[PDB]
Symmetry: C2
Subunit: 453 residues, 2 copies
């Protein structure tokens, strides 16, 4: 029919999918701590392990979509599988193996969904795909803004009208019906727009490969769940992945991909900072920020700590037209990040009563997410001048980011915000210095970049 | 004889002039504070006012040499005049007006000396005026290394075998015989190499203009001494020079020199940091650094605080071959300066007994002088794509650097190093952050400099 309409339909189902995902993510760490009983260094570790799993998932899921089931049918199967993930997260049980399974299913289902939705935009436009992708990208941010703005307060609201359960589970149900929404959306527009796109979708579904792909999926859910439950297992598996990427690198001309080596170590650093906002900045928000947001000197409104993360896509959309108006922008990325961290770093020496900051979150997220904005060029074709080595590197860096968040973990018997503030600002300051170390590294590695050219 | 020997003589007489000068500088703030009774916020202001004067002096002096007296005879005359400056500084009196005159004389005499020695370096080579000038720069650094290592130690030694005066005046006498040394050098070589160079030096010396410039020079010493002694005077004329450069800029195609504007405001900041090392870091060294230097883990040796500043040219020599082996190099400069300030910033939370660091000076100074090195592109030809506006902004920034240095001034009645440590590391840490803002400014202003091209 057109390329814009199927770019539309794929961007819509994308949008609702991410709605579900990020709504879920903000609440997931606060859940592991506040409703489940987890201390915060387990909370970080489990979340980061599940994060790395999630980030490194679309490798296999993509290969399954491209060459085994259809790209569309795989994308759909992902959609169903995560409708079921959130569905699980919705049953009111305080048993971790249940939640851990639910997270396992989201890992599997996500690996099946997103490389294939992205792949379909990519097939819809043959070039203009980058514009397409940026448009695509913005769909993401909008969905996730609303999701994150929404889900915590559903939990808040419900935890207020009823006792502790659901509340959280209500929110996870919101996620679920977000996925479901995106699915009805997809059907109608299924044939409406999607029509031509995929490769092994041109022939009828090989039910043995469907079977075996399902079986292996459930297995992956169990494997995931045993990675999440047992910290030491996950840590070993991450470490193995580490010695693996070091293998691939140390046996893989020298100037261009010692430049590539440097590039992905700098990728890893960047992701550690990025991981900081699910985890350490989240707990600092929960523990040390006046949730009363005043526009000096009005009142409204009053944050729910989780909602702070919505400032991320918000600022992205906000700064997206401004930037509309050369690996030196890594340097800039890192520098601006450094300054975000220093903003939280001096969340202490100004506007403090123990629990006080508020605007520290806003400007922090501006600086940080701006940094993210100036590095949307970390595709691997950009260390070309291999999906595996870098994707695993990057997953490994999600987990690592969780352990750094653990460099600022607070005891559960320590509830005096007056004493927890220092711990968080100490982390944040040494990250800000780290981000400047990293800016130095970037700018210093730019001579190798025009010795290759 | 050859152009290499006349580059040789001008570099030799240069080296010794700079010898006298920097021996004097290190010792000058410690003098105003320890032997004179000045508190450090006066010591900072007075030394910084003298600094700005010194830096903008070579304007008049360069033109006097080019267009009124000879370039050779003006350089020489500058030399005599600073023989007399340091000579003055050596007479043992605690008289403020006395010293201030001595400094006035150093200003006059410098303005006559350095622009002309440098000018004739530039006539000796007719593109390897660049090779010549970097060699020249190295001659400078080595000389100032000798003096900075020597004179403080003289001051200590003589202050030990005799009572309070000389010690210091002894050190300044050392400077004076440094100038005198360089002068004998020049005599011999007077005719030997220097021979041809200058414009109004080809005809016999016009004694009306000799008499009138000497007279105006005496005046320059009185105007100087009164700008230094009375702090408020200096601050008024500094302010005046301020409204002047702000004028000239904002009534003085727009994109390239709004970029030039940005470039010189970052030069201005840069000079503030660099001034931090005569001042706040010097006092910090004198007050909160274990002067016993240990190379893990024997004893040798034991510093004199002033001698710490010798680390500046030392590292320059040490790292200048390293760099032997793109105004983003301004960005990098700022970033590296930044971690220098963070090294001193966490000179406390590391290695502390009250008065403790030692290596902090070394690594900090390593970092600073690396930054200085990587920004040798602050020629005014680098904001072409104006001697005055840039020079005056730059002097004004010497003084400003003095007032920031003052953001860490300590009461004279406060001698508990345990309390003086925080004041200094707080200055230093937030300078480091400011320096990351400047890294961000520079990288951010690089699109303007590729729109000029
Ligand atoms: C339909 C298109 C999407 C439009 C953009 C997205 C809309 C956002 C939906 C959710 C936003 C609401 O989520 C936010 O949560 C906090 C606290 O939990 C609420 O805070 C509220 O509860 C507390 C507790 O009684 C009150 O004292 C407070 O005055 C009140 O503001 C806010 O009312 C709300 O701003
Ligand atoms: C492709 C689609 C995939 C969809 C898969 C969805 C299925 C998910 C199943 C969720 C059920 C989890 O089931 C869970 O099993 C574990 C065993 O490890 C039990 O484990 C339990 O017993 C042991 C006894 O020693 C306790 O110490 C432990 O703390 C406790 O959690 C849980 O009580 C049970 O609730
Ligand atoms: C041409 C290149 C020039 C670069 C090198 C120039 C050489 C240096 C010139 C003079 C060096 C003196 O600089 C240094 O100062 C300190 C402190 O006063 C001295 O310290 C000395 O006196 C003190 C006090 O009794 C002792 O504790 C110490 O053990 C002893 O070494 C050292 O003797 C010296 O190492
Ligand atoms: Zn800091």
């Amino acid at each position: 029919v057109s390329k814009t309409h199927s770019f539309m339909t794929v961007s819509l189902i994308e949008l609702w999918e991410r709605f579900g995902y990020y709504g879920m993510q903000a609440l997931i760490v606060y859940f592991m701590v506040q409703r489940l009983g987890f201390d915060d260094s387990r909370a970080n570790l489990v979340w980061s392990a599940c994060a790395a799993l999630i980030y490194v998932s679309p490798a296999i899921g993509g290969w399954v979509g491209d060459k085994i089931l259809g790209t569309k049918r795989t994308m759909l199967l992902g959609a169903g599988i995560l409708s079921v993930g959130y569905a699980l997260m919705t049953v009111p049980t305080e048993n971790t193996w249940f939640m851990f399974s639910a997270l396992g299913v989201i890992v599997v289902g996500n690996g099946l969904f997103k490389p294939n939705a992205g792949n379909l935009v990519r097939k819809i436009y043959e070039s203009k795909i980058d514009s397409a992708f940026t448009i695509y990208y913005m769909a993401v941010n909008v969905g996730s803004t609303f999701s994150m703005l929404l889900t915590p307060w559903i939990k808040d609201y419900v935890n207020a009208q009823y006792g502790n359960e659901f509340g959280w589970h209500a929110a996870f149900a919101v996620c679920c019906v977000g996925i479901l929404v995106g699915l009805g959306n997809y059907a109608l527009m299924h044939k409406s727009l999607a029509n031509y796109g995929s490769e092994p979708d041109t022939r009828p579904v090989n039910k043995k490969s469907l079977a075996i792909v399902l079986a292996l999926a459930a297995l992956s859910v169990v494997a995931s769940a045993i990675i999440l439950e047992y910290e030491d297992v996950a840590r070993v598996f991450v470490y193995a992945a580490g010695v693996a990427v070091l293998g691939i690198f140390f046996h893989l001309e020298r100037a261009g991909l010692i430049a590539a080596l440097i590039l992905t170590v700098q990728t890893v650093f960047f992701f550690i900072f990025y991981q900081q906002m699910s985890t350490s900045l989240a707990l600092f928000a929960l523990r040390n920020v006046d949730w009363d947001f005043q526009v000096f000197g009005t009142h409204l409104w009053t944050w729910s700590p989780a909602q702070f993360q919505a400032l991320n896509p918000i600022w992205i959309m906000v700064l997206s037209p401004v930037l509309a108006w050369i690996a030196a922008k890594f340097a800039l990325g890192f520098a601006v990040v450094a300054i975000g961290f220093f903003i939280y770093g001096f969340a202490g020496q100004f506007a403090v009563n123990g629990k006080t900051s508020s605007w520290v979150m806003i400007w922090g997220y501006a600086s940080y997410s701006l940094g993210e904005l100036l590095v949307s060029g970390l595709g691997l074709a950009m260390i070309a001048r291999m999906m595996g080595a870098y994707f695993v590197a990057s997953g490994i860096s999600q987990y690592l980011g969780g352990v750094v968040a653990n460099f600022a973990s607070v005891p559960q018997d320590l509830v005096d915000p007056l004493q927890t503030l220092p711990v968080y600002t100490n982390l944040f300051n040494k990250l800000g210095v780290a981000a400047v170390v990293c800016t130095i590294i970037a700018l210093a590695v730019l001579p190798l970049m025009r010795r290759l050219t």
